Amino acid sequence: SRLNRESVIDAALELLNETGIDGLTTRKLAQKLGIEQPTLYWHVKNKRALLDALAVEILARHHDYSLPAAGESWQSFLRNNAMSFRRALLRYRDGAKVHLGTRPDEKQYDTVETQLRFMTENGFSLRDGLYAISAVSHFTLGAVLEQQEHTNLPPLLREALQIMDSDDGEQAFLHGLESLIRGFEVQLTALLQIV
Amino acid sequence: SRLNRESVIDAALELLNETGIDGLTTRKLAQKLGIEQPTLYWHVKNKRALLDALAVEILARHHDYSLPAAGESWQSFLRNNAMSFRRALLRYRDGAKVHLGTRPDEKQYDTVETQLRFMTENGFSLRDGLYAISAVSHFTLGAVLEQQEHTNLPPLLREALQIMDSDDGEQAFLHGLESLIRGFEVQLTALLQIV
Numbered sequence: 001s002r003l004n005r006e007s008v009i010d011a012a013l014e015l016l017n018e019t020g021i022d023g024l025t026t027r028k029l030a031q032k033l034g035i036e037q038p039t040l041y042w043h044v045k046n047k048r049a050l051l052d053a054l055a056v057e058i059l060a061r062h063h064d065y066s067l068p069a070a071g072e073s074w075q076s077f078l079r080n081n082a083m084s085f086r087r088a089l090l091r092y093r094d095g096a097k098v099h100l101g102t103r104p105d106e107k108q109y110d111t112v113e114t115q116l117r118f119m120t121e122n123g124f125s126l127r128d129g130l131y132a133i134s135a136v137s138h139f140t141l142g143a144v145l146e147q148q149e150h151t152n153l154p155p156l157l158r159e160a161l162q163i164m165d166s167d168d169g170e171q172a173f174l175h176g177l178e179s180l181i182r183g184f185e186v187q188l189t190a191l192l193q194i195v
Numbered sequence: 196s197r198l199n200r201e202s203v204i205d206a207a208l209e210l211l212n213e214t215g216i217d218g219l220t221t222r223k224l225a226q227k228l229g230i231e232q233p234t235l236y237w238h239v240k241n242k243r244a245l246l247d248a249l250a251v252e253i254l255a256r257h258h259d260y261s262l263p264a265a266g267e268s269w270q271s272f273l274r275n276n277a278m279s280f281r282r283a284l285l286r287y288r289d290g291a292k293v294h295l296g297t298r299p300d301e302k303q304y305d306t307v308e309t310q311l312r313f314m315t316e317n318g319f320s321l322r323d324g325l326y327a328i329s330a331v332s333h334f335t336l337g338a339v340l341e342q343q344e345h346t347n348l349p350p351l352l353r354e355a356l357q358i359m360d361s362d363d364g365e366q367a368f369l370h371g372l373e374s375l376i377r378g379f380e381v382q383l384t385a386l387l388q389i390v
């Protein structure tokens with residue numbers, strides 16, 4: 001079939017949904033594309049470089065709230081951005097494991113910069129804004145990893161596992177997110193007081 | 196060498212530090228123990244069951260703040276428990292990836308129950324206490340995963356990557372933790388007011 005960048009990524013995401021990250025190989029990617037392994041090698045050198053590219057394209061295709069709206073609060077932006085990040089990660093099998101370990105790509109340089117300058121325009125230091133941005137990322141990735149990778153009790157534990165089951169963990173994620181944003185807001189409003 | 200449970204786990208953690216999770220196999224475990232693969236098979240059926248056991252023993256050996264001290268605040272307990280969880284996860288190469296996906300073991304039933312009852316004794320609903328406990332776990336695992344799995348910039352991004360480098364991410368982790376606990380405390384003190 002066609003082996004432009006877009007078709008190779010399309011095939012690899014479709015294979016990812018079929019096999020998961022551990023089972024995704026260049027050999028099964030060559031099979032799905034109806035080509036020999038050395039043909040594929042011209043286009044994609046190894047599994048490392050494939051996963052790096054998926055990680056970037058899944059966010060390019062499906063993370064539609066990278067940027068704040070005109071006049072949006074920093075609280076509302078972090079909320080929307082976290083929900084968008086979570087959705088994009090959940091959209092493919094093992095999607096969070098695909099994202100894990102990746103550093104911003106040159107193609108998202110300007111996005112991450114904008115996020116950080118935006119927080120600095122709203123009264124954060126670069127440091128405090130970085131802390132807030134990393135805490136949202138680390139909380140969101142952790143939540144989606146346990147959700148995806150989870151794919152004679154004592155009473156509380158029994159009832160709790162029941163509660164976590166009754167939805168995907170969207171409730172626990174959205175509640176924790178509100179707690180993190182409020183804690184950031186309490187820190188920011190304090191200035192130099194003891195808080 | 197000796198193949199009691201304790202010696203097999205000792206060998207497997209030492210191999211884990213050598214190879215990482217992806218490179219850890221029952222074949223290299225048999226080699227390190229100076230045995231044949233079918234001998235090992237009697238003791239440990241597969242990689243799945245090995246990793247499940249490591250995940251539990253790393254916390255049994257090295258997570259020493261599973262439980263609150265006599266008279267400890269819920270805020271102080273969650274802080275200490277998060278730092279202890281983080282330390283235990285960092286202690287082995289890919290330790291967070293080993294933990295990821297695991298459900299409490301029967302051997303830790305009574306620990307997780309105690310944590311949840313403790314939060315309920317301090318004014319949380321079972322639900323709100325579960326949310327707080329899962330938010331700490333998801334935030335801690337996310338932070339340690341990016342730390343472990345990370346193993347012509349625009350200005351803010353350049354300076355920020357510099358800041359995250361200057362330590363392991365202990366600063367960003369401890370700051371985010373304070374934000375999460377304060378957000379939980381604001382939620383809890385609100386009762387039925389609009390907050």
Ligand SMILES: C[NH+](C)c1cc(NC(=O)CNC(C)(C)C)c(O)c2c1C[C@H]1C[C@H]3[C@H]([NH+](C)C)C(O)=C(C(N)=O)C(=O)[C@@]3(O)C(O)=C1C2=O
Nearest residue numbers: 059066085102103104108111133136137345355356359360
């Ligand atoms: C915070 N900046 C400086 C940054 C740093 C690193 N890497 C490190 O900290 C590396 N850590 C060492 C220094 C090696 C220990 C980072 O790894 C990241 C990021 C940025 C985030 C931005 C994330 C953001 N959302 C979820 C808060 C976002 O929406 C985007 C986006 N493309 O639209 C992201 O790319 C983001 O999800 C993301 O993945 C980030 C990083 O990975």
Ligand SMILES: C[NH+](C)c1cc(NC(=O)CNC(C)(C)C)c(O)c2c1C[C@H]1C[C@H]3[C@H]([NH+](C)C)C(O)=C(C(N)=O)C(=O)[C@@]3(O)C(O)=C1C2=O
Nearest residue numbers: 150160161164165254261280297298299303306328331332
């Ligand atoms: C919250 N309880 C109900 C619970 C549930 C799950 N599993 C799920 O939620 C499964 N999710 C589905 C329902 C499949 C989508 C859980 O997976 C967990 C836990 C408990 C935590 C307890 C963690 C705790 N610290 C870090 C807050 C802790 O110190 C211990 C300990 N042994 O001392 C833990 O075991 C803990 O780190 C941990 O791993 C938990 C869970 O994994």
Ligand SMILES: [Cl-]
Nearest residue numbers: 001002003004
């Ligand atoms: Cl072509």
Ligand SMILES: [Cl-]
Nearest residue numbers: 004005006007
């Ligand atoms: Cl293309």
Ligand SMILES: [Cl-]
Nearest residue numbers: 071072073076
């Ligand atoms: Cl707003």
Ligand SMILES: [Cl-]
Nearest residue numbers: 196197198199
């Ligand atoms: Cl023996």
Ligand SMILES: [Cl-]
Nearest residue numbers: 199200201202
């Ligand atoms: Cl033993």
Ligand SMILES: [Cl-]
Nearest residue numbers: 266267268271
């Ligand atoms: Cl205390």
Ligand SMILES: [Mg+2]
Nearest residue numbers: 099102103137
């Ligand atoms: Mg990332």
Ligand SMILES: [Mg+2]
Nearest residue numbers: 294297298332
């Ligand atoms: Mg766990």
